[PDB]
Design a protein around this ligand. Structure first.
Ligand SMILES: O=C1CN(Cc2ccc(F)c(F)c2)C(=O)N1c1cncc(Br)c1
Ligand SMILES: O=C1CN(Cc2ccc(F)c(F)c2)C(=O)N1c1cncc(Br)c1
Ligand code: NA
Lengths: 301, 304
């Protein structure tokens, strides 16, 4: 028993991290097979920041303008291309530590592990969720761009996030590994702001199921709710709508605990009305929304 | 910006984890140089576990009773011996992935990363603190025994914890890598309980400094206090005493943020007496005590 924010073991990703330098700019890149992926903004100067024309900046570069260092070894860049907001540098060595991997684009509410890196070297690993407003609440300093986000269900690494920037509210924006941004953001220093964030309702319900599995029942009640009445109340507390898909997804947790999804919804309504009255759930005094249904089943039993 | 419960990258430890089977028991072991370390209770059946005589159980075993698998490869056990509550299985091959490492024993309040493993396969990594009552609030299922805890101090892995058991309250107990238990526990099936726990004061102060560095400042106030008056309050709220050494250790954070430790102690006094009045700090409604001063400086400064 116990319940913890748990990340995937980071070793398979650690063996893929490299340092990419262009001009006076250094950041991180991801070395898979014979390609290094990194944010295209590595090619920008101080001037360039507001309205960079990336195609024009890139056409001016040769292979030998990109320095790639993997530990103590320089790799040779033998080709370059841009895909959306990522640069792909072809190198003359396949990474001998390349894991089985794929690139997956995730939806808001999905969680993943982040391996924070500086100068091509790993600093730490933690868990994040894609917020409804397409940001992530990470922990990143100057030099962290190119850090990646991943899951490892089975032996296969699913890369889902590459870090590009910090927004003024201190939250983080980035792309999938095909270089498409999550949300409306762009890799330019013009004014942009995250929309107001909301709580991930399906995840809170998952976590309440986790609390029951681990032996806590104090917050249950004798009531039920319709899906529509639940959503009418929940939205007054800045909770995302719960959909019939989400209800279906919670089916297994419902069957394991004997508590119907809409009865758990009624418990959540009361928690929003009353607060916790000095109590905690799984060691928290707030409702947690960064565990998915899949996360709960994997960690519990 | 941002502040997260962050574990060390786990790769150097992942390359040392193996599966150990003895009879119908499978659990995890740590393969360093030519030795596999695991809990000595691997040799017990249920009946044995009620009142084990480990020396007597072990003398009945041959090397070939211990099946050790590193991935899909069997290792050959060529020797077996016990040190306190850990079994050491000598094997015929040195681990080519052995990192630079040391075995260290940690103090209550200190934090470490846990690599939870099942059947010799790492499943997850998270950060823990050794509680003042010598338990850890981990997340472990059947099969997790032999999972380890560690810090990384340079390129050197400092192993500090090996998992042995779950207590009835759902917290966790184990040993250092020399097989000495943290806390007043034994490796047998009898009634055992965690003692009453306390809050790690120096760590809460560290986390308040983390909050200030990240822009969360509402709890600061004009007041200061003395160590003696603060410690009277801590005692009343089941907080560990704050020592002068703790004050010294927070020195850097005090100079960086302009908030003296005893000035921050006056903030913490008020929080204990009055609560948070609906507010949060770094997204929490509780005072967090599982970041050390070193953890905070490392995460707010970028060490790699
Ligand atoms: O290291 C950097 C650089 N940067 C700025 C940036 C400039 C032009 C662009 F087109 C763009 F996408 C991003 C930025 O936000 N970081 C950062 C990333 N994470 C946490 C911190 Br603190 C800083
Ligand atoms: O997997 C096991 C086996 N086990 C047996 C045991 C009982 C008493 C002892 F003194 C002892 F040394 C071993 C035990 O506690 N776990 C466990 C460890 N962590 C989280 C879970 Br759930 C289970
Ligand atoms: Na003060």
């Amino acid at each position: 028993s116990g319940f913890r924010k748990m990340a995937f073991p980071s070793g398979k990703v650690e063996g893929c991290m490299v340092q990419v330098t262009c001009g006076t700019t250094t950041l991180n890149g991801l070395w898979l097979d014979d390609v290094v992926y990194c944010p295209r903004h590595v090619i920008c100067t101080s001037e360039d920041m507001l309205n960079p024309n990336y195609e024009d900046l890139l056409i001016r570069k040769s292979n030998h303008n990109f320095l790639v260092q993997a530990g103590n070894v320089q790799l040779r860049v033998i080709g370059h291309s841009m895909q959306n907001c990522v640069l792909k540098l072809k190198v003359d060595t396949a990474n001998p530590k390349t894991p089985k991997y794929k690139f997956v684009r995730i939806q808001p509410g999905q969680t993943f592990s982040v391996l924070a890196c500086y100068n091509g070297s790993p600093s730490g690993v933690y868990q994040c969720a894609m917020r409804p407003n397409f940001t992530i609440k990470g922990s990143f300093l100057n030099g962290s761009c190119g850090s990646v986000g991943f899951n490892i269900d089975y032996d296969c690494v699913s890369f889902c996030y590459m870090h590009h920037m910090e927004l003024p509210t201190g939250v983080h924006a980035g792309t999938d590994l095909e270089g498409n941004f999550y949300g409306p953001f762009v890799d330019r220093q013009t004014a942009q702001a995250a929309g107001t964030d909301t709580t991930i309702t399906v995840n809170v319900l998952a976590w309440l199921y986790a609390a029951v599995i681990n032996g806590d029942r104090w917050f249950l009640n004798r009531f039920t709710t319709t899906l529509n009445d639940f959503n009418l109340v929940a939205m007054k507390y800045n909770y995302e709508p719960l959909t019939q898909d989400h209800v279906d997804i919670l089916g297994p947790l419902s069957a394991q605990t004997g508590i119907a999804v809409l009865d758990m919804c009624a418990s959540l309504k009361e928690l929003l009305q009353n607060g916790m009255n000095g109590r905690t759930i799984l060691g928290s005094a707030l409702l947690e929304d960064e565990f998915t249904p899949f996360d709960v089943v994997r960690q519990c039993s």
